[PDB]
Amino acid sequence: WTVPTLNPDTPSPIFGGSTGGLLRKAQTEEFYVITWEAKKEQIFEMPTGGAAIMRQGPNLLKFGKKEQCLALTTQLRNKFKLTPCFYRVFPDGKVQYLHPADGVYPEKVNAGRVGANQNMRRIGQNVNPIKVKFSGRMMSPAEI
Amino acid sequence: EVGPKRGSLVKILRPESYWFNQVGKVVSVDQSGVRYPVVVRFENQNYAGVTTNNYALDEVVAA
Amino acid sequence: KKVKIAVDRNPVETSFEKWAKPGHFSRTLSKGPNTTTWIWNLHADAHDFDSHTSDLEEISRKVFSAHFGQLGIIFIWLSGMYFHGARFSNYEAWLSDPTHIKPSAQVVWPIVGQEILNGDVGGGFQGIQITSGFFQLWRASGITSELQLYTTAIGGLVMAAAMFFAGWFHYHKAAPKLEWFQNVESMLNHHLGGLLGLGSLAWAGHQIHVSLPVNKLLDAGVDPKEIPLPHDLLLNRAIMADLYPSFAKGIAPFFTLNWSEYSDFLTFKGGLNPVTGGLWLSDTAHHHVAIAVLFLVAGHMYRTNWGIGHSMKEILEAHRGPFTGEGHVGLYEILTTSWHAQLAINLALFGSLSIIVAHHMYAMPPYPYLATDYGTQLSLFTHHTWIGGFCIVGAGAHAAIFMVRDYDPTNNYNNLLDRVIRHRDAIISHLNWVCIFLGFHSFGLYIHNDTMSALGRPQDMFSDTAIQLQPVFAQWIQNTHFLAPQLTAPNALAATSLTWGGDLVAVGGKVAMMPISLGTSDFMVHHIHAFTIHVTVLILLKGVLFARSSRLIPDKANLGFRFPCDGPGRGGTCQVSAWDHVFLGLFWMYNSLSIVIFHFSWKMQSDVWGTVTASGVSHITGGNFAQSANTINGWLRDFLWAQSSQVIQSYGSALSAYGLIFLGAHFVWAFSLMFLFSGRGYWQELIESIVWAHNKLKVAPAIQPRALSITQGRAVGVAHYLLGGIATTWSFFLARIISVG
Amino acid sequence: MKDFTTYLSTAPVIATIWFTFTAGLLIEINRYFPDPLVF
Amino acid sequence: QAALYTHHQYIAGFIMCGAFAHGAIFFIRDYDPEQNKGNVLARMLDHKEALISHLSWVSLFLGFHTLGLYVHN
Amino acid sequence: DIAGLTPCSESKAYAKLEKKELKTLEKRLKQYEADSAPAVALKATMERTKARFANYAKAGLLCGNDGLPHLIADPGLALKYGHAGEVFIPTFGFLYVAGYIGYVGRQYLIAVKGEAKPTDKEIIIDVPLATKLAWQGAGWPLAAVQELQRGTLLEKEENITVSPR
Amino acid sequence: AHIVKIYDTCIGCTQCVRACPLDVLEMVPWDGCKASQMASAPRTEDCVGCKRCETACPTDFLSVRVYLGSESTRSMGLSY
Amino acid sequence: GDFLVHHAIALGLHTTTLILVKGALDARGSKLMPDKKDFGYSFPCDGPGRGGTCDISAYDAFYLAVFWMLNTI
Ligand code: CLA
Ligand code: CLA
Ligand code: CLA
Ligand code: CLA
Ligand code: CLA
Ligand code: CLA
Ligand code: CLA
Ligand SMILES: CC1=C(/C=C/C(C)=C/C=C\C(C)=C\C=C\C=C(C)\C=C\C=C(C)\C=C\C2=C(C)CCCC2(C)C)C(C)(C)CCC1
Ligand code: SF4
Ligand code: SF4
Ligand code: SF4
Question: How many domains does chain G have?
Answer without folding.
Answer: 1
